[PDB]
Ligand binder design. Structure first.
Ligand SMILES: Cn1cc(C#CCn2cnc3c(c(-c4cccc(C#N)c4)cn3CC(=O)Nc3ccncc3Cl)c2=O)cn1
Ligand SMILES: Cn1cc(C#CCn2cnc3c(c(-c4cccc(C#N)c4)cn3CC(=O)Nc3ccncc3Cl)c2=O)cn1
Ligand SMILES: [Cl-]
Ligand SMILES: [Cl-]
Ligand SMILES: [Cl-]
Ligand SMILES: [Cl-]
Lengths: 122, 122
């Protein structure tokens, strides 16, 4: 019965991305080979089965640094981190395989499914 | 040029509300007279000019407890906190004035404007 605000969730996500761009209340750095990316653990948990499983565990919840598998492509990771904070996925012929493999590792099914649709559409 | 995921922002907000319901990575309690409400500072900053102004200030960013004005109605506050995390506003004849005054204090213009529309619609 409540009044629905159709733009509200997008407004929240935009403001969370603005906080990330200023490093405000970021609480983790994700290390991907020679690169590092700061983020909010809450957003990572909201968007990734891997990060959900890491930070729900009381053993790991307070970690300030997460080292990803050294095989993960930093560009693929950055594309997916930007997707988490924007709802926009930068998929191209030159990055689809790295993005798809990274989304499998991060446990991000809708992106993996979208990568399969991209391949089927050539 | 990116692929747009129209449901993604709502999915993120739902998962942030699920984390709030489990008290996972909440980092502040908001005290409203005899009641207390836990939340994520990032979501509060994303949805309120008052909380943005409090937590952007390096003087106050690390506060774990915020005491609101003792005049603020706890039910009005709870309605607006739920709106922040759901995009749904529970506006009724019995709560409109308290919700509107609380939204003015929290600096939440779209809700204040919606309260004005509710009054104009009787
Ligand atoms: C090999 N492989 C495994 C998979 C997988 C997969 C499945 N999968 C699993 N977990 C996921 C997601 C998502 C999610 C969210 C938004 C966009 C996208 C995308 N794109 C994904 C969040 N999460 C964590 C969660 O559900 N968080 C949560 C749950 C309950 N309460 C609070 C919180 Cl935070 C997901 O897709 C793919 N390949
Ligand atoms: C007396 N009175 C003053 C006012 C006012 C008012 C105006 N107002 C001011 N600030 C606001 C909002 C919002 C906001 C967001 C979503 C829904 C609603 C509603 N409903 C409001 C966020 N915010 C903080 C911000 O803009 N955060 C942010 C900005 C830039 N980067 C990162 C971040 Cl987190 C707002 O409405 C009304 N009455
Ligand atoms: Cl971005
Ligand atoms: Cl390309
Ligand atoms: Cl709720
Ligand atoms: Cl009523």
């Amino acid at each position: 019965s409540q009044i629905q605000f159709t733009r509200h969730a997008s407004d929240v996500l935009l403001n969370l991305n603005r906080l990330r761009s200023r490093d405000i209340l970021t609480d983790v750095v994700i290390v991907v080979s020679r690169e590092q990316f700061r983020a909010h653990k809450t957003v990572l948990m909201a968007c990734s089965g891997l990060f959900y499983s890491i930070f729900t565990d009381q053993l790991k919840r307070n970690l300030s640094v997460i080292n990803l598998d050294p095989e993960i492509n930093p560009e693929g990771f950055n594309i997916l981190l930007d997707f988490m904070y924007t709802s926009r996925l930068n998929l191209r012929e030159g990055n689809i395989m790295a993005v798809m493999a990274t989304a499998m590792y991060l446990q991000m099914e809708h992106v993996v499914d979208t990568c399969r649709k991209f391949i089927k559409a050539s």
